[PDB]
Each structure stands twice: as C-alpha cells, then as structure tokens.
Amino acid sequence: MKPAARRRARECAVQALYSWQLSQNDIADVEYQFLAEQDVKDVDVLYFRELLAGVATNTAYLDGLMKPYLSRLLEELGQVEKAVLRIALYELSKRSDVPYKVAINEAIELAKSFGAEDSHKFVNGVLDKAAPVIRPNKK
Amino acid sequence: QNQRIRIRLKAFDHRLIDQATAEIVETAKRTGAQVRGPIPLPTRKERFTVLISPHVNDQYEIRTHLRLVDIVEPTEKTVDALMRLDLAAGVDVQIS
Amino acid sequence: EDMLPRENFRPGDRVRGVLYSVRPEARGAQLFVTRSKPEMLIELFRIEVPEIGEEVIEIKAAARDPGSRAKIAVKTNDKRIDPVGACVGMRGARVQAVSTELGGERIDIVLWDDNPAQFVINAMAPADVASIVVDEDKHTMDIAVEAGNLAQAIGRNGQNVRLASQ
C-alpha cells in the first residue's frame, strides 16, 4: 500500500536520529548535513521532517514512557534500542496516516534489522505494553 | 594535515563498538573539532563455518554492523589522540 | 624477562606494555615495563569487558604461565549478568583476542567462590574435581580427580593446577 520511499525515509530517519543521539549535536545542522550530503532522492522529505520534529519535541516524553520499562533488563540500556523505541512509539502516538499494524510491522523490521538478534523481542514487548496504553483505539 | 578523513567501523558486538564509538566522539570533542556519524548499516550476516566432527550416516548468522565517521577539519591534537590511544583486543578502528 | 620468550620486534612497531616499577633516585633504569606479568592480563580484561570497570564483575585472583596456560577468577555482583559467560563472551571471541596477545595461552575464566574448596572445584574448568579435603592447619587441600581425567587436569609438569594454587 506504500512505496519503498517511505521505508527508505524511515531507515534514514533511524540512522539520523541514532547519529544525533550518539554524536550529541544540534538537530538542525546534522539534519541539513544528512539531507544535503546523503542519499535523499528516494527519501520522503515531509515524513523525515515530521518524524524528526516529533522525536525532538518528545525526547522527554518518550524517556518518561521508557522509564517504567527499564527494570528487568539483564544488561543496561543501549542506544539503538532507545532510538527504535522512540521512533516506534512516536509512530504509535500521533501519526494518523500510518496504520497501527503497519507501524508495528515496520518497527519489528527495524528492531530485527538494526537492534540485535535478541533486542527485537524487548522492542516488541515495550510496544505491546505501551501502544494499547497510548492508542486504545489502535489506529 | 590530510583533512579528508574517512572511517569505517566494524561491529561484531554492538555494545563494545558503541563504547568505542563514544570514546571516538569524546576524543574528537575534547580536542576542538566536532565529529559526525555513525549513520549505521543494517544486519550484514556472515558465512562462517565451525570446526566440528561430521555426523556418520553452533552459529550460522553473525550479526555485524558498520559505522561511518567523516572528518573534514581536524587538528594536530585530534590526530595525536588518534595516534596515542588504546583499544580493546579483537576490534577494528580502521581509519579509511 | 618481562617480555614473552619469542618477542623480536622491529623499528616502527607500536608495542604495548605496563609500567610496574620505578627507582627515581637510581641513575640507571627508572621506568620498568612488562608484558608477561598478570597485571597486564588485569588491564586486558579491564579494557576489553566494560562491566568489570562498571562494578558488575569482580576479578580478584589470576595466575599465568606465559604462552601456555593461565587461570583467572571472576565474580558477579549483579545476578542479571553471568560473569563467566560474559568474560568469556560470545563464542569466546574476547579472550581469544587476549589469546592473540599472549600467543595461544589457554586462559581458564572461572567463577570466584567464597568457599575455597568449591572455588577450586569451579577453578578446574577444562577438568573435573571429585572431592577436596581442606586442612588449612596443615596447609593442605587434597584434591580427588576422576579416573581418565588425569592428563587434562595435570597437563605439563603439574603447573596449571599449581597455577590454580596461585
């Protein structure tokens, strides 16, 4: 139902937000470098801007959501898992054009292809315990 | 100062290489310049066999990731810290 | 004597070592560096595994015979992390790199225990221990081995179990 440009924009947004949260710089300069120096010919511009703006304005919101779900972890919290959970919970909080099962399926694909071979079940557990709370309608 | 600086970064374990990446970001930010990256790669599995006895009549997937560091304006203290640091055994810090 | 017995380097080789001794009043050699002392192994397990420095895994005892055989004891504080399974790492990929540094030296990463007899039972990791009679007044720990597992437990010259003593 959706072309590969949305998937490419989502993966480039995962890469850009991981680079922002690990390099710890300004979001505007890193965003301008990532849009003027990387492959953006198959990247949805408005999807990228709205997703990064929502993550940048809901840093503390998604951290407060993640804070009750950082107890039973054997190791400590990684950064790739945090980026996948932030993008997955913003795609399940305010995004109306993206469906519920479609966003969960893309989040599971991102967690299996980027997080780990063992952290994608943690991502799916946090999503299954948070997305009916955030979206009881499951839209 | 050979200002066009490329770094590819190999990862078997993501935690150790994220630790080394944070160390690279720290040793680049404490010298004056600012660092960019990583912009990571998805799961690139390996084809590695084991030394096991055959059955008369382990692992197959090795989750490896790549990270990218671009430096365009270095200092002498930055390349000195890149030539006076230490690392963990078995990982690659190859400045391409 | 501080190096390995087969190290012959060349001009232009970044070699790594540990400062261990100093004599500033003496006019001669004043900064002694080693590569074959077990404090180098402590520094290797500190640089390699992060959670040992993050106060999760406690390395208390270690012993080596360089190039051939070594033992080291770890102990977790967080029960959520296996100490031996993480200090060995995934597929032993960490300590084998440490075996790159020591040249094939088999490093037994075992679990520290407060009971010394159960610690020696845990310490013979490529071996098997049946029973240990501890008499510290006579300074003896009589260790029973199973039949057939004598050569893999003793090894060369009884050294590694002596390293287990160390």
Quote the CA–CA distance of C48 and C90 in Å, as a whole number: 13
Alpha-carbon dihedral angle through residues B5, B9, B15, B19, given to the nearest 10 degrees: -20
Residue B42: exposure state from Cβ atoms within 10 A (0-12, 13-18, ≥19): middle
| Rounded distance between C-alpha atoms, residue A63 and residue A53, angstroms | 16
Structural tokens at position C71: 């033992």
Structure token pair of residue C109? 């990463």
Among C41, C48, C49, C88, the residue to mutate for chain B (most B Cβ within 10 A): C48
CA-based radius of gyration for chain B: 17
| Structural determination approach | cryo-EM
Show which residues on chain B lie within 8 Å of chain A, measured between beta carbons.
Answer: 14-15, 18, 21-22, 25, 34-40, 42-43, 61, 63
Q: Which domain holds residue B26?
A: 1-96
Number of domains in chain B: 1
The resolution in Å comes to: 3.7
User: Which residues on chain A are in Cβ contact (under 8 Å) with B42?
Assistant: 11, 113-114
Dihedral in degrees, nearest 10, Cα atoms B82, B86, B87, B90:
110
> What residues of C are in contact with residue B15 (Cβ under 8 Å)?
50
C147: exposed, middle or buried (C-beta count within 10 Å: 0-12, 13-18, 19+)?
Answer: exposed
Angle at Cα B8 formed by Cα B6 and Cα B14, nearest 5°? 145
What residues in A contact C81, CB-CB < 8 Å?
74-75
Neighbours of chain A (3+ CB pairs under 8 A): B, C
The minimal CB distance from B38 to the residues A11, A19, A75 is found for A19
DSSP-derived 3-state class of residue B23:
helix
Beta-carbon contacts below 8 Å between A and B: 46
Q: d(Cα B81, Cα B28) in Å, to the nearest integer?
A: 8
Domain with residue B34: its CATH number is: 3.30.70.600
Cα–Cα distances in angstroms (integers) from residue B26 to residues A22, B32, B33, B37, B49, in the given order:
11, 11, 11, 13, 37
